[PDB]
Amino acid sequence: LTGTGVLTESNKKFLPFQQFGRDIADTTDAVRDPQTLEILDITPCSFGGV
Amino acid sequence: YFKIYSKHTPINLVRDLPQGFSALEPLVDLPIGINITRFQTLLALHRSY
Ligand SMILES: *[C@@H]1O[C@H](CO)[C@@H](O)[C@H](O)[C@H]1NC(C)=O
Ligand SMILES: *[C@@H]1O[C@H](CO)[C@@H](O)[C@H](O)[C@H]1NC(C)=O
């Protein structure tokens, strides 16, 4: 994965074979750390109109 | 790619496998690419005395 977002510590249950995770259609919201085993959560950071 | 799936679920019925739904997680991806067209089942028999 590549891009910008907030990396949080969610409580998702990632199976051993699972590596990535989408939300609705090709929108990644949670990944797995390559070095460690902890599960992150890619969240789009603060946006909005002025 | 040899996608092996396995799901060990206990049951109390002897024959006529019951209905229902179950999942199958990938066990391990085996390196393949050879030509395979015939599958042969290999069981084990218990020789007695
Ligand atoms: C990878 O290296 C980092 C470096 O500190 C270490 O913390 C981590 O445990 C290592 N991961 C594995 C799976 O060995
Ligand atoms: C695999 O071998 C069989 C045996 O004749 C042949 O019919 C088939 O075309 C072969 N498949 C490939 C992909 O080589």
Chain B residues at the A interface, defined by Cβ less than 8 Å, are: 25-26
Of B32, B34, B37, B38, the residue with max ligand 2 atoms within 8 A of its CB, to mutate for a pocket test, comes to B37
Q: Which residue has the tokens 């395979």?
A: B36
CB atoms within 10 A of CB A3: 7
Tokens of B30: 């085996």
- Strands B2-6 and B25-30, how do they pair? antiparallel
Q: Which residues of B touch A17 (CB under 8 A)?
A: 25-26
CA distances in angstroms from B13 to A7, B18, B19, listed in the order given: 48, 8, 11
Q: What angle do CA B39, B40, B44 make, to 5 degrees?
A: 145
What is the stated resolution of the deposited model, in angstroms?
3.8
Residue A30 contacts residue A19 (beta carbons within 8 Å): no
